[PDB]
Design a binder for this molecule. Structure first.
Ligand code: 6V3
Length: 292
């Protein structure tokens, strides 16, 4: 695909906006467009940068972060800046946190599935994310458009990780489906998966390996529960494909209007077998029965 070689003189570096496993991400400008640049900080890091650059060049989708180009001196990636920050931050970040709706929760999960389904349907060889979680989901367009990315890990992903991955089996693209199942629960409940557990990360791995999943949700539509709990399955072959998730979720959006309303209202918080959803399903059930 069309990957621009870039002159660092033309980039107007403004400020640091967090960082990944390697490198430091900075907000900048470049030919009158807001850009996130991921600059390298030691000559040692170039092998990983090449894999990242070769990956980002292949992918071209509305729900995966767009690489504009890369400067080879000094070595940096140049991506479209996502103003909204991570989904992790919108859900769990610093107060004041934004209000959002079941429609938003479903639209984020739909958009994420669309992006992963694109990765999975790629040729000659299918790409697998293997680290799908809200810190790697960026928001744009007032919190309404979600973009998959990967900040990378050094050596916290345990909560969203499929059991077959962390147990050192042969994993497949069905590990992404597991992760998505957990993200869906997370955006619906606005709870971090496994804070009831806590302690070090191997506690979560152990828990999940013995069958522990997140708790079920009071008054969750049976169809959404069916989908969610299939994605949690120990056996990877019993989880749906992303093609299937995208089709289902696309169709459920009929009963979840208002996903294009930007996040703009504030929210104040409390936390109680089951758990209450943060979002409200009254309107879903209302719209559903009108059809059925
Ligand atoms: C085995 N692989 C697993 C993952 N793979 C990947 C799949 C899809 C996207 C990927 C993006 C990458 N790169 C990437 O997204 N880097 C990156 C992420 C965030 C970032 O920071 C921002 C970018 C834009 N707006 C921002 N606003 C605040 C930070 C920020 C800078 C670089 C790296 C890998 C990717 C394929 C197979």
């Amino acid at each position: 695909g069309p990957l621009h070689m870039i002159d660092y003189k033309e980039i107007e570096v403004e400020e640091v906006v967090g960082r990944g496993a390697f490198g430091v991400v900075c907000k900048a400008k470049w030919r009158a467009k807001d850009v996130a640049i991921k600059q390298i900080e030691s000559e040692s890091e170039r092998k990983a940068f090449i894999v990242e650059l070769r990956q980002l060049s292949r992918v071209n989708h509305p729900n995966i972060v767009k690489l504009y180009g890369a400067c080879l001196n000094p070595v940096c990636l140049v991506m479209e800046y996502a103003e909204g920050g991570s989904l992790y931050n919108v859900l769990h970040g610093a107060e004041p946190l934004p209000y959002y709706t079941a429609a938003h929760a479903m639209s984020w999960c739909l958009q994420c599935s669309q992006g992963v389904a694109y990765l999975h349907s790629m040729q000659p060889k299918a790409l697998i994310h293997r680290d799908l979680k809200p810190p790697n989901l960026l928001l744009v367009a007032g919190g309404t458009v979600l973009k998959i990315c990967d900040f990378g890990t050094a050596c916290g992903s345990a909560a969203w990780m499929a059991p077959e991955v962390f147990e050192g089996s042969n994993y497949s693209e069905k590990c992404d489906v597991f992760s998505w199942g957990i993200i869906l629960w997370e955006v619906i409940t606005r709870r971090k998966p496994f804070d009831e557990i806590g302690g070090p990360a191997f506690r979560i791995m152990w828990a999940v390996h013995n069958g522990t999943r997140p708790p079920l949700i009071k008054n969750l539509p049976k169809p959404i529960e069916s989908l969610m709990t299939r994605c949690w399955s120990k056996d990877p072959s019993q989880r749906p494909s992303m093609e299937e998730i995208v089709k289902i979720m696309t169709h459920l959006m009929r009963y979840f209007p208002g996903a294009d309303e930007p996040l703009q209202y504030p929210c104040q918080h409390s936390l109680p077998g089951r758990v209450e959803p943060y979002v409200d399903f009254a309107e879903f059930y209302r719209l559903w029965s009108v059809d059925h």
